Write a structure and sequence with these properties.
With about 140 residues, the chain is mostly beta strands. It folds into two domains: about 40 residues, no CATH class; about 100 residues, no CATH class. The strands form two sheets. The chain has a seven-stranded antiparallel β-sheet, with no helix packed on it. Strands 1-3-2 form a three-stranded antiparallel β-sheet. It is globular. It starts with a strand and ends in a 10-residue tail after the last strand. It binds 2-cyano-~{N}-(1,3,5-trimethylpyrazol-4-yl)ethanamide and zinc ion. The site of zinc ion has 6 residues, from loops. This is Protease 2A.
Length: about 140
């Protein structure tokens, strides 16, 4: 589980979005496993705006933050999972590391702030849904 809280936005894995999230929808994209809902309270999480391929992620299934190298966001074939069929997930970054389904929503952070959230895993790879291209999370 886990979210990003920036301005009047809450950024969650689309597959973990609540009824309250869908009742307060701003933007969702199934191909990226992202959903953004409206917040009453201002958020102050800083979104990275950068090209970084090094950072740190939170892994709930180890209670540990791990430093990783990761690929730039891309369209990647992800084995069938419980919530998406076998498919191209878009805007996905991969790193060598541990992840289990409930790690979804752990933050990946670089020197510039929040890069993304844990979304895919298996075969020793963890995938993160990028948010750095979502420039509108900054404004309005
Ligand atoms: C973070 C992660 N690690 N692993 C092994 C898998 C399958 C995931 N993602 C999901 O299961 C999301 C769905 N459906
Ligand atoms: Zn960065």
């Amino acid at each position: 589980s886990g979210a990003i809280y920036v301005g009047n936005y809450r950024v969650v894995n689309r597959h973990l979005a609540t009824h309250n999230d869908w009742a307060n929808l701003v933007w969702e994209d199934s191909s990226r496993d992202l959903l953004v809902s409206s917040t009453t309270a201002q958020g102050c999480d800083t979104i990275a705006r950068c090209d970084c391929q090094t950072g740190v992620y939170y892994c709930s299934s180890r209670r540990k933050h791990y430093p990783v190298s990761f690929s730039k966001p891309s369209l990647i074939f992800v084995e069938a999972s419980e919530y998406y069929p076998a498919r191209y997930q878009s805007h996905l970054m991969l790193a060598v590391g541990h992840s289990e389904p409930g790690d979804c929503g752990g933050i990946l952070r670089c020197q510039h702030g929040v890069v993304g959230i844990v979304s895919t895993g298996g075969n020793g790879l963890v995938g993160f849904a990028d948010v750095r291209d979502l420039l509108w999370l900054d404004e309005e």
